[PDB]
Every structure is written in C-alpha cells, then in structure tokens.
CSV table of C-alpha atoms and ligand atoms in Angstrom, one decimal:
chain,number,residue,atom,x,y,z
J,6,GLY,CA,34.5,70.2,98.0
J,7,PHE,CA,37.3,68.9,97.9
J,8,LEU,CA,37.6,70.1,94.5
J,9,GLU,CA,35.9,73.5,94.2
J,10,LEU,CA,39.2,75.2,94.5
J,11,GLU,CA,40.9,73.4,92.0
J,12,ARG,CA,37.7,73.6,90.1
J,13,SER,CA,37.6,77.3,90.2
J,14,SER,CA,37.8,79.0,86.9
J,15,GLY,CA,40.6,81.4,87.4
J,16,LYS,CA,42.7,83.4,89.8
J,17,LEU,CA,39.7,85.7,90.7
J,18,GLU,CA,37.3,82.8,91.4
J,19,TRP,CA,40.2,80.5,93.3
J,20,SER,CA,40.8,83.5,95.4
J,21,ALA,CA,37.4,84.3,96.5
J,22,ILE,CA,36.6,80.4,97.4
J,23,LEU,CA,39.6,80.2,99.2
J,24,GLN,CA,38.8,83.3,101.1
J,25,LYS,CA,35.1,82.3,101.4
J,26,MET,CA,36.4,78.7,103.0
J,27,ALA,CA,38.6,80.7,105.0
J,28,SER,CA,35.5,83.0,106.3
J,29,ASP,CA,33.2,80.0,106.8
J,30,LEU,CA,35.7,78.4,108.7
J,31,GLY,CA,36.0,81.4,110.9
J,32,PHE,CA,39.1,83.2,109.9
J,33,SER,CA,38.6,86.6,108.7
J,34,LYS,CA,42.4,87.2,107.1
J,35,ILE,CA,44.1,84.8,105.2
J,36,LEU,CA,47.2,85.1,102.8
J,37,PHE,CA,48.5,82.3,100.6
J,38,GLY,CA,52.1,82.8,99.3
J,39,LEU,CA,54.0,80.7,97.0
J,40,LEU,CA,57.3,80.9,95.3
J,41,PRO,CA,58.8,78.7,92.5
J,42,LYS,CA,61.2,76.4,93.2
J,43,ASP,CA,64.7,77.7,94.1
J,44,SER,CA,63.4,81.3,94.3
J,45,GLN,CA,66.6,83.8,94.9
J,46,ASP,CA,63.9,86.6,96.1
J,47,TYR,CA,60.3,87.1,95.8
J,48,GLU,CA,60.2,88.5,92.7
J,49,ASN,CA,58.1,85.5,90.9
J,50,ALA,CA,56.0,85.1,93.9
J,51,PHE,CA,52.2,84.1,93.8
J,52,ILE,CA,50.6,86.0,96.4
J,53,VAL,CA,47.1,86.5,97.2
J,54,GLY,CA,44.7,87.3,100.2
J,55,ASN,CA,42.8,89.9,102.2
J,56,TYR,CA,45.2,90.8,104.6
J,57,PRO,CA,45.1,94.6,105.2
J,58,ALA,CA,46.8,96.8,102.4
J,59,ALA,CA,48.9,98.7,104.5
J,60,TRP,CA,50.0,95.7,106.4
J,61,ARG,CA,51.1,94.3,103.1
J,62,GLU,CA,53.1,97.2,102.3
J,63,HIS,CA,54.6,97.8,105.7
J,64,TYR,CA,55.8,94.1,105.8
J,65,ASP,CA,57.2,94.3,102.2
J,66,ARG,CA,58.9,97.8,103.1
J,67,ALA,CA,60.2,96.7,106.5
J,68,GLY,CA,61.8,93.4,105.0
J,69,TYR,CA,59.7,91.5,107.7
J,70,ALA,CA,60.3,88.2,105.5
J,71,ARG,CA,63.8,88.1,107.1
J,72,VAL,CA,62.2,88.9,110.8
J,73,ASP,CA,58.9,86.9,110.8
J,74,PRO,CA,59.7,83.9,112.7
J,75,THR,CA,56.9,81.6,110.6
J,76,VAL,CA,58.9,82.4,107.5
J,77,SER,CA,61.9,80.5,108.8
J,78,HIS,CA,59.6,77.8,110.4
J,79,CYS,CA,58.3,77.1,106.7
J,80,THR,CA,61.9,76.5,105.4
J,81,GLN,CA,62.2,73.7,108.2
J,82,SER,CA,58.9,72.1,108.7
J,83,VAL,CA,55.8,70.7,107.4
J,84,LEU,CA,53.9,71.4,110.6
J,85,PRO,CA,51.8,74.3,111.6
J,86,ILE,CA,53.6,77.4,113.5
J,87,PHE,CA,50.9,79.0,116.2
J,88,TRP,CA,51.2,82.7,116.6
J,89,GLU,CA,52.1,82.6,120.1
J,90,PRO,CA,54.5,84.3,122.7
J,91,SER,CA,57.3,81.8,122.6
J,92,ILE,CA,57.9,82.0,118.6
J,93,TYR,CA,59.1,85.7,119.1
J,94,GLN,CA,62.5,85.5,120.3
J,95,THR,CA,64.5,89.1,119.7
J,96,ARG,CA,63.3,92.3,120.1
J,97,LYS,CA,63.0,92.8,116.3
J,98,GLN,CA,60.6,89.5,116.0
J,99,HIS,CA,59.0,91.3,118.9
J,100,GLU,CA,58.4,94.2,117.4
J,101,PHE,CA,57.2,92.9,114.2
J,102,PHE,CA,54.3,91.1,116.5
J,103,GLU,CA,53.6,94.4,117.5
J,104,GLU,CA,53.4,95.7,114.2
J,105,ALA,CA,51.2,92.8,113.3
J,106,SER,CA,49.0,93.1,116.2
J,107,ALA,CA,48.5,97.0,115.6
J,108,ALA,CA,47.5,96.0,112.0
J,109,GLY,CA,44.7,93.9,113.5
J,110,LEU,CA,46.1,90.4,113.2
J,111,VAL,CA,47.0,88.7,116.9
J,112,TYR,CA,46.1,85.4,116.7
J,113,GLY,CA,46.5,82.7,114.2
J,114,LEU,CA,49.0,80.5,112.6
J,115,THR,CA,50.9,79.8,109.8
J,116,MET,CA,50.7,76.7,107.5
J,117,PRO,CA,54.0,75.7,105.5
J,118,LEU,CA,53.9,74.9,102.0
J,119,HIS,CA,55.9,72.3,99.8
J,120,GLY,CA,54.8,71.6,96.6
J,121,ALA,CA,55.5,68.4,94.3
J,122,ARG,CA,57.8,70.6,91.9
J,123,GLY,CA,59.3,72.4,94.8
J,124,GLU,CA,57.0,75.2,95.3
J,125,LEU,CA,57.7,77.0,98.6
J,126,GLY,CA,55.1,79.0,100.7
J,127,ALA,CA,53.1,79.7,103.2
J,128,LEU,CA,49.0,79.7,104.3
J,129,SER,CA,48.9,82.2,107.2
J,130,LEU,CA,45.3,82.5,108.7
J,131,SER,CA,44.3,85.2,111.5
J,132,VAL,CA,41.4,84.8,113.7
J,133,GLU,CA,39.7,87.6,115.1
J,134,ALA,CA,39.2,86.2,118.5
J,135,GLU,CA,38.4,88.0,122.0
J,136,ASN,CA,41.6,86.6,123.5
J,137,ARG,CA,44.3,83.9,123.7
J,138,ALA,CA,42.2,81.2,125.1
J,139,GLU,CA,39.2,81.7,123.0
J,140,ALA,CA,41.8,81.9,119.7
J,141,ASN,CA,43.5,78.5,120.9
J,142,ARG,CA,39.8,76.6,121.3
J,143,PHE,CA,38.4,77.7,118.1
J,144,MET,CA,41.7,76.9,116.4
J,145,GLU,CA,41.9,73.5,117.9
J,146,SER,CA,38.2,72.7,116.4
J,147,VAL,CA,39.0,73.8,112.9
J,148,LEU,CA,42.8,72.5,112.6
J,149,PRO,CA,42.2,69.2,111.1
J,150,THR,CA,39.8,70.6,108.5
J,151,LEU,CA,42.5,73.9,107.9
J,152,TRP,CA,45.2,70.7,107.5
J,153,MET,CA,43.8,69.5,104.8
J,154,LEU,CA,43.0,73.0,103.6
J,155,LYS,CA,46.5,73.6,103.1
J,156,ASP,CA,47.4,70.8,100.8
J,157,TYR,CA,44.2,71.2,98.5
J,158,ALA,CA,45.2,75.2,98.4
J,159,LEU,CA,48.9,74.6,97.3
J,160,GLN,CA,47.8,71.9,94.6
J,161,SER,CA,45.2,74.4,93.0
J,162,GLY,CA,47.5,77.3,93.7
J,163,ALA,CA,50.5,75.9,92.3
J,164,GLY,CA,48.6,74.6,89.0
J,165,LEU,CA,47.1,78.4,88.8
J,166,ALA,CA,50.3,80.3,89.8
J,167,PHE,CA,52.8,78.4,87.4
J,168,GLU,CA,51.4,76.9,84.5
E,6,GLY,CA,49.1,60.8,120.1
E,7,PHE,CA,51.1,62.5,117.6
E,8,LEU,CA,54.2,63.6,120.0
E,9,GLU,CA,55.0,60.1,120.6
E,10,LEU,CA,56.6,59.8,117.3
E,11,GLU,CA,58.9,62.4,118.2
E,12,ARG,CA,59.6,61.0,121.4
E,13,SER,CA,60.8,57.6,120.4
E,14,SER,CA,64.2,56.5,119.8
E,15,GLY,CA,64.9,54.4,116.9
E,16,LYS,CA,63.3,52.7,113.7
E,17,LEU,CA,62.0,49.8,115.4
E,18,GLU,CA,59.9,51.8,117.7
E,19,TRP,CA,58.8,54.8,115.6
E,20,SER,CA,57.5,52.5,113.2
E,21,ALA,CA,55.8,50.3,115.9
E,22,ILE,CA,53.9,53.6,116.8
E,23,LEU,CA,53.2,54.7,113.6
E,24,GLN,CA,51.9,51.0,112.6
E,25,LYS,CA,49.7,51.3,116.0
E,26,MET,CA,48.3,54.7,115.2
E,27,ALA,CA,47.0,53.8,111.5
E,28,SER,CA,45.8,50.9,113.0
E,29,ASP,CA,43.7,52.8,115.5
E,30,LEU,CA,42.4,54.8,112.3
E,31,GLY,CA,41.5,51.2,110.7
E,32,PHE,CA,44.6,50.7,108.8
E,33,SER,CA,45.7,47.1,109.4
E,34,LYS,CA,49.0,47.5,107.1
E,35,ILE,CA,51.0,50.6,106.0
E,36,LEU,CA,54.5,51.4,104.0
E,37,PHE,CA,55.8,54.2,105.1
E,38,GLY,CA,58.7,55.3,102.3
E,39,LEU,CA,60.8,58.4,101.8
E,40,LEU,CA,63.9,59.3,99.9
E,41,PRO,CA,66.4,62.1,100.4
E,42,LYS,CA,66.2,65.3,97.7
E,43,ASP,CA,66.8,64.4,94.1
E,44,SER,CA,67.3,60.8,94.7
E,45,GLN,CA,68.1,58.9,91.7
E,46,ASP,CA,67.2,55.2,92.9
E,47,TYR,CA,66.1,53.5,96.1
E,48,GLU,CA,69.2,52.7,97.5
E,49,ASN,CA,69.0,55.3,100.6
E,50,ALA,CA,65.2,55.3,101.0
E,51,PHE,CA,63.8,54.8,104.2
E,52,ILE,CA,60.9,52.4,104.0
E,53,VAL,CA,59.5,50.9,107.0
E,54,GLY,CA,55.9,49.4,108.0
E,55,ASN,CA,54.1,45.9,107.8
E,56,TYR,CA,53.3,45.2,104.4
E,57,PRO,CA,54.1,41.4,104.1
E,58,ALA,CA,57.8,40.6,103.0
E,59,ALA,CA,56.9,38.2,99.8
E,60,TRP,CA,55.0,41.2,98.5
E,61,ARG,CA,57.7,43.8,99.2
E,62,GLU,CA,60.3,41.5,97.6
E,63,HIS,CA,58.1,40.6,94.8
E,64,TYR,CA,57.4,44.6,94.1
E,65,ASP,CA,60.9,45.3,94.2
E,66,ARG,CA,61.9,42.4,91.9
E,67,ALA,CA,59.2,43.0,89.4
E,68,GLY,CA,60.2,46.7,89.6
E,69,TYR,CA,56.6,48.1,90.1
E,70,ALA,CA,58.3,51.3,91.1
E,71,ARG,CA,57.7,52.2,87.9
E,72,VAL,CA,53.9,50.5,87.1
E,73,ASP,CA,51.9,51.3,90.5
E,74,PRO,CA,50.2,54.7,89.6
E,75,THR,CA,50.6,56.3,93.1
E,76,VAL,CA,54.1,56.3,92.8
E,77,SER,CA,54.0,58.7,89.7
E,78,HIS,CA,51.5,60.7,91.1
E,79,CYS,CA,53.4,61.5,94.3
E,80,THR,CA,56.0,63.1,92.3
E,81,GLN,CA,53.1,65.3,91.0
E,82,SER,CA,50.9,65.8,93.8
E,83,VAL,CA,50.6,66.9,97.3
E,84,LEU,CA,46.9,65.2,97.4
E,85,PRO,CA,46.2,61.5,98.4
E,86,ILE,CA,45.4,59.0,95.5
E,87,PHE,CA,42.8,56.1,96.4
E,88,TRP,CA,43.7,52.8,95.1
E,89,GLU,CA,41.1,51.8,92.1
E,90,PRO,CA,42.0,50.1,89.0
E,91,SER,CA,40.7,53.2,87.4
E,92,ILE,CA,44.4,54.0,87.8
E,93,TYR,CA,45.3,51.1,86.4
E,94,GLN,CA,45.5,51.3,82.4
E,95,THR,CA,48.3,49.4,81.2
E,96,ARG,CA,48.9,45.5,81.0
E,97,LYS,CA,51.9,45.8,83.9
E,98,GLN,CA,49.2,47.9,85.9
E,99,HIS,CA,46.3,45.5,85.5
E,100,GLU,CA,49.2,42.8,86.7
E,101,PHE,CA,50.2,45.3,89.5
E,102,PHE,CA,46.5,45.4,90.7
E,103,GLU,CA,46.1,41.6,90.2
E,104,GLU,CA,49.2,40.9,92.5
E,105,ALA,CA,48.7,43.5,95.1
E,106,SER,CA,44.9,42.1,95.8
E,107,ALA,CA,46.6,38.5,95.6
E,108,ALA,CA,48.9,39.9,98.5
E,109,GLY,CA,45.6,41.0,100.4
E,110,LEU,CA,46.0,45.0,99.7
E,111,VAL,CA,43.2,45.6,97.8
E,112,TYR,CA,41.8,48.8,99.3
E,113,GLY,CA,43.5,52.0,100.5
E,114,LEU,CA,45.3,55.1,99.7
E,115,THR,CA,48.8,56.4,99.1
E,116,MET,CA,49.4,60.1,100.7
E,117,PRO,CA,52.4,61.8,98.9
E,118,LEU,CA,54.8,63.3,101.3
E,119,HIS,CA,56.9,66.1,100.3
E,120,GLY,CA,59.1,67.4,102.9
E,121,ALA,CA,60.3,70.8,103.7
E,122,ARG,CA,64.0,69.8,102.7
E,123,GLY,CA,62.6,68.1,99.4
E,124,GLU,CA,62.3,64.5,100.8
E,125,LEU,CA,59.9,62.9,98.5
E,126,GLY,CA,58.2,59.7,99.4
E,127,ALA,CA,54.3,58.2,100.6
E,128,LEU,CA,52.5,56.6,103.3
E,129,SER,CA,50.3,54.0,101.7
E,130,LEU,CA,47.9,52.4,103.9
E,131,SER,CA,45.7,49.3,103.4
E,132,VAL,CA,41.9,48.7,104.5
E,133,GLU,CA,40.4,45.3,105.2
E,134,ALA,CA,36.7,46.1,104.1
E,135,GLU,CA,34.0,43.8,102.7
E,136,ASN,CA,33.8,46.0,99.8
E,137,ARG,CA,35.1,49.0,98.0
E,138,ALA,CA,32.0,51.2,99.2
E,139,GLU,CA,32.3,50.1,102.7
E,140,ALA,CA,36.2,50.8,102.5
E,141,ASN,CA,35.6,54.2,101.2
E,142,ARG,CA,33.5,54.9,103.7
E,143,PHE,CA,35.9,53.8,106.3
E,144,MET,CA,38.5,55.9,104.9
E,145,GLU,CA,36.7,59.2,104.5
E,146,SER,CA,35.9,58.8,108.1
E,147,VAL,CA,39.5,59.2,109.5
E,148,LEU,CA,40.8,61.4,106.5
E,149,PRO,CA,41.2,64.7,108.5
E,150,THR,CA,42.9,62.7,111.3
E,151,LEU,CA,45.1,60.9,108.5
E,152,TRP,CA,45.7,64.1,106.5
E,153,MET,CA,47.4,65.4,110.0
E,154,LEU,CA,49.2,62.1,110.6
E,155,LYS,CA,51.0,62.0,107.4
E,156,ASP,CA,52.4,65.2,108.0
E,157,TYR,CA,53.6,64.3,111.4
E,158,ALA,CA,54.9,61.2,110.0
E,159,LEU,CA,57.0,63.0,107.6
E,160,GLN,CA,58.4,65.8,110.0
E,161,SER,CA,59.6,63.1,112.5
E,162,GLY,CA,60.6,60.6,109.9
E,163,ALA,CA,62.7,62.7,107.8
E,164,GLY,CA,64.8,63.5,111.1
E,165,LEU,CA,65.0,59.6,111.7
E,166,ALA,CA,65.8,58.6,108.3
E,167,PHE,CA,68.3,61.2,107.5
E,168,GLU,CA,69.4,63.0,110.3
E,169,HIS,CA,69.4,61.8,114.0
E,170,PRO,CA,72.4,59.4,115.1
H,1,LIG,C1,60.5,81.3,102.3
H,1,LIG,C2,59.3,80.6,102.3
H,1,LIG,C3,58.2,80.9,101.6
H,1,LIG,C4,57.0,82.0,101.9
H,1,LIG,C5,56.7,82.9,101.1
H,1,LIG,C6,55.6,83.9,101.7
H,1,LIG,C7,54.9,83.6,102.3
H,1,LIG,C8,54.1,84.5,102.6
H,1,LIG,O1,53.0,84.8,102.9
H,1,LIG,O2,54.3,85.4,103.9
H,1,LIG,C9,54.0,86.8,104.2
H,1,LIG,C10,53.9,87.8,103.4
H,1,LIG,BR1,54.8,87.8,101.8
H,1,LIG,C11,53.5,89.3,103.7
H,1,LIG,C12,52.7,89.1,104.9
H,1,LIG,BR2,51.9,90.7,105.4
H,1,LIG,C13,52.7,87.8,105.8
H,1,LIG,C14,53.5,86.8,105.5
H,1,LIG,C15,53.4,85.6,106.5
H,1,LIG,N1,53.1,86.0,107.8
H,1,LIG,C16,52.3,86.3,108.3
H,1,LIG,O3,51.3,86.0,108.1
H,1,LIG,C17,52.3,86.4,109.9
H,1,LIG,C18,52.9,85.4,110.3
H,1,LIG,C19,52.9,85.6,112.1
H,1,LIG,C20,52.4,86.5,112.9
H,1,LIG,C21,51.8,87.6,112.2
H,1,LIG,C22,51.6,87.5,110.6
H,1,LIG,N2,51.3,88.6,109.9
H,1,LIG,O4,51.4,88.8,108.6
H,1,LIG,O5,49.7,89.5,110.5
H,2,LIG,C1,58.7,58.4,93.4
H,2,LIG,C2,58.0,58.8,94.7
H,2,LIG,C3,57.4,57.5,95.8
H,2,LIG,C4,58.3,57.4,96.7
H,2,LIG,C5,59.0,56.2,97.1
H,2,LIG,C6,58.3,55.6,98.3
H,2,LIG,C7,56.8,55.1,97.9
H,2,LIG,C8,56.8,53.7,98.3
H,2,LIG,O1,57.1,53.1,99.4
H,2,LIG,O2,56.5,52.6,97.2
H,2,LIG,C9,56.4,51.3,97.6
H,2,LIG,C10,57.1,50.7,97.8
H,2,LIG,BR1,59.1,51.0,97.7
H,2,LIG,C11,56.7,49.1,98.0
H,2,LIG,C12,55.6,48.2,98.0
H,2,LIG,BR2,55.2,46.9,98.3
H,2,LIG,C13,54.7,49.5,97.8
H,2,LIG,C14,54.8,50.8,97.1
H,2,LIG,C15,53.8,51.9,97.0
H,2,LIG,N1,52.4,51.4,97.0
H,2,LIG,C16,51.2,50.6,97.4
H,2,LIG,O3,51.6,50.6,98.6
H,2,LIG,C17,50.4,50.2,96.9
H,2,LIG,C18,49.4,51.2,96.0
H,2,LIG,C19,48.4,51.0,95.3
H,2,LIG,C20,48.0,49.6,95.3
H,2,LIG,C21,48.7,48.7,96.3
H,2,LIG,C22,49.9,49.0,96.6
H,2,LIG,N2,50.5,48.0,97.6
H,2,LIG,O4,51.5,48.0,97.6
H,2,LIG,O5,49.6,46.9,97.9
C-alpha cells in the first residue's frame, strides 16, 4: 500500500502512517509541507511531520524559507535535491546548514511536490547516518521507493489538506 | 542512464533516448505529451513518441482527448492510471478502447506529468503481453524505475519543449 495513505482515516492516521513508512524505510525525521495554488505566504500551509519542535520554531523565526536552497529548488524542478555541500553556496546558506546539523538534521533529501491543482510543496527526509558515504549508500538503495512515496503522499495529502 | 536525456540535443535524439529507455523497461510504444501552463487547446503542445501515425491522426480527428479517461485523470492526479475498460463507461469510451485495441494499444498505463512551472501532460506507455494479468506483472515489475523516468522525462522534456533554443 500503495493505498494505505489514501485509505487512512484522517490527518492523524495519515501523519502516523507517513512517518511510519519513512521510519520503516530508514528515515527517522520527515516533513511534508504543502501550499495551495498561488499562495502568497505560508498562512494556508499544511505542514506535517516529526522534525523537532525547536528546529521547526527556529526555521520559522529565522525566515529560513528564504535561505533554504531546497525551497528555491522545489520552485524550479520535480527532481530530488540531496543535502550535500554544493547546494549551500552563500554564508547564509552555510549558516542554515550548520543550524540544521546542530538540530540533528545533517543527511537527507528534499522531494519537490507539484500537485494536479497547483499545490506546491516539499517532502523532506533526514537519515541518521554515521557519515556521508553511509548516507548516500542508504539513500541510493531506497530512492526508487521514496520516489513513488512522494507522489502518493502528495495526492493523498492534498485531498486531506484542501478538501 | 537518466543523465542521457539532458545530455541530448534536439527533439529527435531526446525522443529516441526516451523510447529506448521505455523499450528497455518492456514498453514498445510510448507517447510523451506536454502542454504549457494553463493551455486552452493543444496547439502549443509538445508531443513525441512512437505511437503509430494512423492512430495519432485518428485520435485527433475523432476528438478522443475529450473521451480518453486517462486525460481527465491527468488533470486531477499525479498517480498513474492503468488502461482498463473499467476506466471506460460511455459509448464513445468503448469506441475509444475498441479503436485503441485495433491499433494494437491494449495494455499500458498513463503517468500524469505536472511540472514545476505548471506544465501539464502525460507519459503513456503500452506493453505487449499475452493477457492483462501478464501485462500487469510486466508493468508492476518496473513501476519504481518508470516512476523515476517520468519525472526525469518531465524535467528534461519541459526544457526541450519550451525553453532551450
Ligand atoms: C515554495 C516551495 C513550497 C515549500 C513549502 C514548505 C516545504 C517545507 O516543509 O519547508 C520546510 C519548513 Br516549512 C520547515 C522546515 Br524546519 C524545513 C523545511 C524544508 N527544508 C528541509 O527539510 C531541509 C533541507 C535541507 C537541509 C536541512 C533541512 N532541514 O530542515 O533540516
Ligand atoms: C489535459 C491533460 C493531458 C495532457 C495532454 C497530453 C496527453 C496525451 O499525449 O494524450 C494523447 C494524445 Br495527444 C494522443 C494519443 Br494517440 C493518446 C494520448 C493519451 N492516451 C493514451 O496513450 C491511451 C490511454 C489509454 C488507452 C489507450 C491509449 N492510446 O492512445 O493507445
């Protein structure tokens, strides 16, 4: 399933299944973020996951939506962006990397979300890996599954979030 | 192998690469169709693949874009729709399925495409098989690789269709 996310009964069970799927696949931290079509800000955002509260708060308070290189990437692509040194170009972006790392989120990837009704978002997952080599090996072995996952999460989440 | 789609220059080589990748996954016929954001007709569509010419012409002339259940599905979902007379209901819909079958396009699936810039389209692929059960086994066996392929085709195809000189 393949169906279990769509066949979840409400936000709570959806969130838990999503987090559990991620957990089973090997990702201890996930965040699904979705905005309605042509959103001006994040006032109508549907954001669900198990990222630490302190980090969620820090990201909001620091305005990191405007710094985070995965955000801009999502506006330009349907392909995943892996969390690697090359995506952090400016000192501001390097600072974001360091703060995310301090919060425990070092290795991972962000999958852009583009819904059939203009929904815009991202599914981010972090793996608690020993090092970059181990992180990449793990991520390669799960990537095709995660690629299907992001679209199922999008289709179901959008239905749950905006109708 | 996905890197080859960006590496290519021109509609011809790109389409050839995509067709080969699809063939390697067990699909002998494919159609990649993509419209720019908020298109009101198909005049500005980018449509490439190896569906037979006669079928392409008939589908257009008969107005099957308004009948084909995979088309309406693509406007509503990011998930694939498998080709099944179950997705047919109306008179024209069984006409459509009958004519598609006659053209040799019986089993397959359509993967909706929703681009970062509002591009809307579909990657449709047909699989040759002895029966639907076998067709389903062939398709399920490659679904994760196809899922990646459709997004790689979308990202590279949108550039080729609408952006690159
Ligand atoms: C405009 C497009 C719609 C994007 C809609 C929001 C998508 C989203 O969830 O962005 C967030 C938000 Br809101 C809060 C946090 Br905290 C994190 C993100 C996404 N970024 C990452 O997950 C990320 C990415 C790289 C490195 C570290 C991290 N991280 O947070 O630990
Ligand atoms: C508005 C969003 C759409 C986006 C528009 C692009 C989708 C597309 O390419 O539709 C077509 C077109 Br144009 C011509 C033909 Br011929 C076929 C399709 C899509 N349908 C199938 O491939 C299909 C589907 C089911 C059964 C048989 C077939 N078939 O043609 O053999």
